Design an enzyme around this catalytic site. Structure first.
Site, PDB file in Angstrom:
ATOM      1  N   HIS A   1     -58.893   5.312  55.886  1.00 39.92           N
ATOM      2  CA  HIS A   1     -57.986   5.548  56.504  1.00 39.92           C
ATOM      3  C   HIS A   1     -56.942   4.446  55.877  1.00 39.92           C
ATOM      4  CE1 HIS A   1     -55.052   6.928  59.592  1.00 39.92           C
ATOM      5  NE2 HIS A   1     -56.150   7.811  60.202  1.00 39.92           N
ATOM      6  N   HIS A   2     -56.806   3.171  56.135  1.00 40.07           N
ATOM      7  CA  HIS A   2     -56.056   2.187  55.623  1.00 40.07           C
ATOM      8  C   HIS A   2     -56.739   1.114  55.148  1.00 40.07           C
ATOM      9  CE1 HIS A   2     -55.523   0.717  59.933  1.00 40.07           C
ATOM     10  NE2 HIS A   2     -55.456   2.225  59.979  1.00 40.07           N
TER      11      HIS A   2
ATOM     12  N   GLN B   1     -59.048  -6.126  54.937  1.00 39.28           N
ATOM     13  CA  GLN B   1     -59.099  -5.383  56.070  1.00 39.28           C
ATOM     14  C   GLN B   1     -59.323  -4.027  55.870  1.00 39.28           C
ATOM     15  OE1 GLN B   1     -56.160  -5.243  59.233  1.00 39.28           O
ATOM     16  NE2 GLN B   1     -57.682  -5.495  60.682  1.00 39.28           N
TER      17      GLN B   1
ATOM     18  N   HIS C   1     -60.121  -0.185  57.337  1.00 40.10           N
ATOM     19  CA  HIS C   1     -60.230   0.554  58.505  1.00 40.10           C
ATOM     20  C   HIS C   1     -61.055   1.853  58.097  1.00 40.10           C
ATOM     21  CE1 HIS C   1     -58.316   2.645  62.412  1.00 40.10           C
ATOM     22  NE2 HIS C   1     -59.535   3.157  61.912  1.00 40.10           N
TER      23      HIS C   1
ATOM     24  N   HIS D   1     -45.368  -2.290  62.694  1.00 42.31           N
ATOM     25  CA  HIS D   1     -46.549  -2.272  63.122  1.00 42.31           C
ATOM     26  C   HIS D   1     -46.278  -2.136  64.801  1.00 42.31           C
ATOM     27  CE1 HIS D   1     -50.838  -2.623  64.039  1.00 42.31           C
ATOM     28  NE2 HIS D   1     -50.636  -3.357  65.107  1.00 42.31           N
TER      29      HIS D   1
ATOM     30  N   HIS E   1     -48.564  -0.265  68.347  1.00 40.54           N
ATOM     31  CA  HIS E   1     -49.642   0.477  68.865  1.00 40.54           C
ATOM     32  C   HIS E   1     -49.156   1.899  69.654  1.00 40.54           C
ATOM     33  CE1 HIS E   1     -51.892  -3.607  69.395  1.00 40.54           C
ATOM     34  NE2 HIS E   1     -51.930  -3.320  68.100  1.00 40.54           N
TER      35      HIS E   1
ATOM     36  N   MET F   1     -47.560  -4.436  70.439  1.00 38.25           N
ATOM     37  CA  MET F   1     -47.067  -5.149  69.513  1.00 38.25           C
ATOM     38  C   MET F   1     -45.789  -4.559  68.788  1.00 38.25           C
ATOM     39  SD  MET F   1     -49.987  -6.885  67.242  1.00 38.25           S
ATOM     40  CE  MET F   1     -49.943  -8.374  66.515  1.00 38.25           C
TER      41      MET F   1
HETATM   42  O1  LIG Z   1     -53.340  -3.322  65.972  1.00 32.80           O
HETATM   43  N1  LIG Z   1     -54.221  -3.978  66.860  1.00 32.80           N
HETATM   44  O2  LIG Z   1     -53.642  -5.267  67.386  1.00 32.80           O
HETATM   45 CU   LIG Z   2     -51.597  -4.809  66.246  1.00 34.73          CU
END
Ligand SMILES: O=N[O-]
Ligand SMILES: [Cu+2]
Ligand SMILES: O=N[O-]
Ligand code: NI
Length: 306
Positions: free
Chosen positions: A62-63, A125, A127, A194, A196, A266
């Site tokens: 996905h990313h 990271q 995903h 960013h 959620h 966030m």
């Molecule tokens: O983007 N999850 O903190």
């Molecule tokens: Cu976050």
């Protein structure tokens, strides 16, 4: 593909080398799994990250995100990123999104890594979105490093909320973030948002003499790549940087605050800039709201959802 005997470090010439940061043949078991691994820099002396190449399994990924830090969260081979990215500050460098292909770094712009002060580790990271060959995954990023001093230094100005509370069923909650810029001029060339699930829109501006110059506007529900800035933007000693996130409470049963879990929120705007090497610094952060009354004259675009 998975590397094998040839190793992650590839020389390009006497001063350049590519470094492949790959998952060590991993195999997920659930949907939406976050995997993380780290790579110490092979050189100890200072170097410049000048380019990134993605190596992603277009079926499964996905990313991806690449960070620079000095204390990765786990001494392991890989770990669930819920455990954490870095104990120290995780510096974002690269962000690959599936349906939003990243823009290249401008030429002559590079990140400072290693040496006395720069990052000593890379952390990756990955995903994984959807999941049966029992294949071991080696997706990751290949990174062009040079030892040649770059004339322009890439850097990050992170803008983030901390004190936000989103009451339940509350129609519109704004998170304002504002800071007075106090360094040598910088030039913003890309941005990433960013949030959620509750975020509707995120906007970042430069306010100079009381006038708003749009840096970036995005739906956080849209893929979260670094998107290029329409017209390069200089921020200069004196200017104020201003960001707003718009959140909804509708859908939630209880109040949501800033946190790291998926039921927290966030409001993060990542402004990616470059500076002249001699003036450059690599990371700034604004978590304050120094001019809250200034937001009275924020453009109406920042409140209507894209
Ligand atoms: O983007 N999850 O903190
Ligand atoms: Cu976050
Ligand atoms: O950044 N002044 O062109
Ligand atoms: Ni300029």
């Amino acid at each position: 593909e998975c590397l094998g005997t040839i190793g992650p470090v590839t020389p390009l010439d006497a001063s350049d080398f590519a470094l492949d940061i790959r998952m060590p043949g991993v195999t997920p078991k659930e949907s939406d799994t976050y995997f993380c691994m780290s790579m110490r820099l092979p050189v100890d002396e200072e170097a410049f990250v000048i380019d990134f190449k993605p190596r992603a399994s277009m079926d499964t990924v996905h990313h991806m995100l690449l960070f620079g830090c000095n204390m990765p969260s786990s001494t392991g081979s890989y770990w669930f990123c819920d455990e954490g990215t870095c104990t120290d500050k995780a510096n974002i460098l690269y962000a690959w999104a599936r349906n939003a292909p990243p823009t290249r770094l401008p030429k002559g712009v590079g990140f400072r890594v290693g040496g006395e002060t720069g990052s000593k580790y890379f952390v990756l990271q990955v995903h994984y979105g959807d999941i049966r060959d029992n294949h071991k995954d080696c997706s990751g990023v290949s990174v062009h490093l040079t030892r040649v001093p770059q004339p322009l230094i890439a850097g990050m100005y992170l803008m983030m909320s901390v004190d936000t509370v989103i009451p339940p069923g509350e129609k519109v909650v704004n998170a304002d973030i504002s800071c007075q810029y106090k360094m040598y001029p910088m030039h913003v060339f890309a941005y990433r948002v960013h949030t959620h699930h509750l975020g509707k829109v995120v906007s970042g501006y430069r306010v100079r003499n009381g006038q708003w110059t749009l840096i970036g506007r995005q739906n956080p529900q849209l893929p979260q790549a670094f998107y290029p800035v329409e017209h390069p933007v200089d921020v200069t000693f004196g200017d104020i940087l201003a960001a707003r996130c718009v959140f909804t409470g509708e859908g939630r049963t209880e109040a949501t605050h800033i946190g790291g879990t998926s039921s927290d929120e966030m409001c993060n705007l990542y402004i990616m800039y470059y500076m002249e090497a001699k003036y450059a610094l690599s990371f700034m952060t604004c978590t304050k709201n120094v001019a809250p009354d200034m937001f009275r004259t924020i453009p109406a675009e920042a409140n209507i959802p894209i």
